[PDB]
């Protein structure tokens, strides 16, 4: 490891990210850690979002662990544009790395307790998710609203390589996942890229479904996937499908990585803030825990890693149904370090 | 009186037809029918996919039946483009009805057979799966591809409209389900276009959910949904979803409709052509059937409607696990008319 900047974030982030900063503390000692209050604390202290030298600061860090961002007290997409989208395109964070593994403890929404285990690589930093476009007309029966999702050989090619890397790390099998049908353009830039990628990576073998299609079989047959590398809009979607299909958004973790190692890689418990139960010991930090094991992971740190998603599964294993406080939850997990 | 266009088309289209066309003729008992031969029969006779002539025919009826069009015979998106898509734009289906319900006697991927019971009114004729984009410098590492989506006033009223018509004859709940925080345009466009026409509807509660939301409910919480209203490329995604945790695809029937009535609305089960199966009387009609329920219900057939529901639903609930041959189901549900 070496450096973190932590930004705990708000609503149940702080309580979460305790949890997650004593195990990442627990697994490698010596870690120089910077605390930013960014978020709502931020914005009504100072009235920032992100300022330019914040982001400055940030790629001093080797990684950011966030917890979450958003509270109600700050006015709408303020927080979700101006900080974490924004964090997301100037720390080139082109990877969206969302592991989908059901664990024993963890009940699945589907029938039957299939064996989960995929992986999503979401682009994260082209399509349409990007804000361009424009309306005409406002208000009027004559509304004209566009959305332009540009895609790049560039931004494709990045995140496609970096999926045939962990799928040659895990079982050696990729689903692109797309809608080549009717996206022509974005498809094919997609499917020809994954083909000429596919060229270096033969012991992997790729399989293509519409992103309709691949929503049922995330519910049908979700052993099916390995890695999954989709676009930023369709990953959108499925990632939270692969969350909910492995218990939820709650128990699930987030990588926001720029493969380059250029900027920080920003890890994150994939749930919000839930400013309802903020500060109250009740939020389970199992998902921002998950989320170190993650940072370690990109970081090199595979035993530390290792441990953590070790004690994760332990925690799961024998939690049953008992009301666990946030912190008898890191008590839990550090106790299986 | 009621005319009827029938596409029985290829593979077990013809056979499910037959069904849902017996079906039709006991309920409704005067029924001009005219059958039209498209799909990949006729292209290969004659190289047509749809002349204008046959949608100036098509326009002279008051509803078509289409049982599944495609065959692997012929190339990637021709008979889906110049047939279905154009039969789409041409007679101005925007809106597309996707009726989901989970049925006494069908199994869902879901955990604990919830109830389920939703339609989704999905816009039909705008949004980027109408072919808008391209690219450049393609096959380099330069390539720029784009994908536009054009959304209007006057496409996405239409189908909201649709939608609170259909939520007050139903459970009075409607869900618009997008992206608004990011589709800013677009999204802003729906937004205020639910709320504007939900002026009109004050017995319906409107809520609102972005997409990976929404779809993280329809496996978690699916009996939340009454009438869901979105765009054609979450509809396209949501509506597989949808029948997927309502016991498959080969379940469910769609209504491809223009409101307006000028142009004949079109109505077929889902699932594709399966040539695989085709005339070995395998194929479950079931779907073809609901589909004409649905057209029934469009052309103000309402009794008639409720009795095939019915006895779709007798069929559905008593079929149990035997192994049934096409008109067997047929007969199975005609007599319980």
């Given at each position: 490891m070496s450096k973190l900047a932590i930004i705990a974030g708000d609503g149940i982030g702080p309580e979460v990210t305790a949890e997650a900063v004593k195990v990442l503390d627990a697994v490698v000692p010596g870690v120089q850690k910077t605390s930013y209050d960014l978020g709502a604390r931020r914005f009504h202290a100072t009235?920032?979002?992100?300022?330019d030298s914040v982001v400055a600061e940030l790629r001093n860090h080797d990684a950011i662990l966030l917890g979450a961002i958003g509270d109600?007290?700050?006015?709408?997409?303020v927080l979700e544009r101006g900080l974490l989208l924004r964090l997301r395109f100037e720390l080139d964070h082109h990877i969206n790395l969302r592991p989908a593994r059901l664990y024993p403890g963890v009940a699945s929404?589907?029938?039957?307790?299939p064996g989960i285990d995929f992986v999503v690589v979401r682009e994260g930093?082209?399509?349409?998710?990007?804000?361009?476009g424009g309306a005409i007309?406002?208000?009027?029966?004559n509304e004209v609203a566009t959305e332009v999702s540009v895609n790049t050989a560039f931004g494709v090619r990045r995140v496609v390589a970096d999926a045939f890397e962990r799928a040659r790390r895990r079982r050696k099998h990729l689903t692109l996942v797309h809608k080549?049908?009717?996206?022509?353009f974005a498809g094919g830039l997609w499917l020809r890229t994954v083909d000429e990628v596919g060229e270096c990576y033969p012991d992997v073998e790729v399989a293509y479904q519409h992103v309709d299609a691949a929503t049922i079989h995330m519910i049908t047959?979700?052993?099916?996937?390995?890695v999954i590398v989709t676009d930023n809009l369709f990953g959108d979607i499925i990632t939270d499908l692969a969350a909910a299909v492995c218990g939820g958004i709650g128990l699930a973790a987030s990588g926001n990585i720029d493969a380059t190692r250029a900027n920080p890689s920003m890890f994150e418990p994939?749930?919000?803030?839930?400013?309802?139960?903020?500060?109250?010991?009740?939020?389970?930090?199992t998902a921002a825990i998950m989320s170190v094991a993650l940072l370690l992971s990109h970081l090199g740190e595979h035993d530390a890693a290792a441990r953590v998603d070790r004690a994760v599964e332990a925690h799961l294993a024998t939690r049953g149904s008992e009301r666990l406080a946030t912190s008898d939850v890191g008590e839990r997990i550090a106790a299986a370090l």
């Open positions: 009235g920032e979002v992100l300022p109600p007290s700050v006015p709408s997409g929404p589907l029938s039957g307790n930093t082209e399509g349409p998710y990007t804000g361009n007309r406002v208000g009027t029966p080549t049908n009717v996206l022509t047959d979700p052993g099916r996937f390995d994939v749930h919000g803030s839930a400013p309802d139960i903020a500060g109250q010991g009740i939020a389970d930090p």
